[PDB]
């Protein structure tokens, strides 16, 4: 039960981590949308992405580990 959940969520952890990395690489190529690679707006996008992504990964890892710890 809570063990199941925790295991499914680990898969999510890995998948989402990978997708956030893909999204970061994509942004690199979309840079024109904010004025190009030398744009402060683009730089801002990338810092926001890094931060949002890191929090998500962090929260996710926490979730997986807490959920397993509970079921214990």
């Amino acid at each position: 039960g809570i063990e199941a959940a925790a295991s499914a969520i680990q898969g999510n952890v890995t998948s989402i981590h990978s997708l956030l990395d893909e999204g970061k690489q994509s942004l690199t190529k979309l840079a024109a949308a904010w004025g190009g690679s030398g744009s402060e707006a683009y730089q801002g996008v990338q810092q926001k992405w890094d931060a949002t992504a890191t929090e998500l990964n962090n929260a996710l890892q926490n979730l997986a580990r807490t959920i397993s710890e509970a079921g214990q």
């Binding site: 499914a8 999510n12 994509s26 979309l30 949308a33 996008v45 949002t52 992504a53 929260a59 710890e69």
Partner: protein, 74 residues
């Protein structure tokens, strides 16, 4: 950027899907938390939901930017 746009929508879609999976799995546990560890898990949930809502929000802002730049570039 034109072609990168499709790939980003794909990534965004995959992320939202994975996030929906976590929310669904976690939601199926809303009942059953008990003890101090349960309190911890509930808090872990809320933290994830806040992080995931910020991610989703971000994905939408980025997609809008890309669409609006596309129009401009067209």
């Amino acid at each position: 950027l034109a072609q990168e746009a499709g790939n980003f929508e794909r990534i965004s879609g995959d992320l939202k899907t994975q996030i929906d999976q976590v929310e669904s799995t976690a939601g199926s546990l809303q009942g059953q938390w008990r003890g101090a560890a349960g309190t911890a898990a509930q808090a872990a949930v809320v933290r994830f939901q806040e992080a995931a809502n910020k991610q989703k929000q971000e994905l939408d802002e980025i997609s809008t930017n890309i669409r609006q730049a596309g129009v401009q570039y067209s």
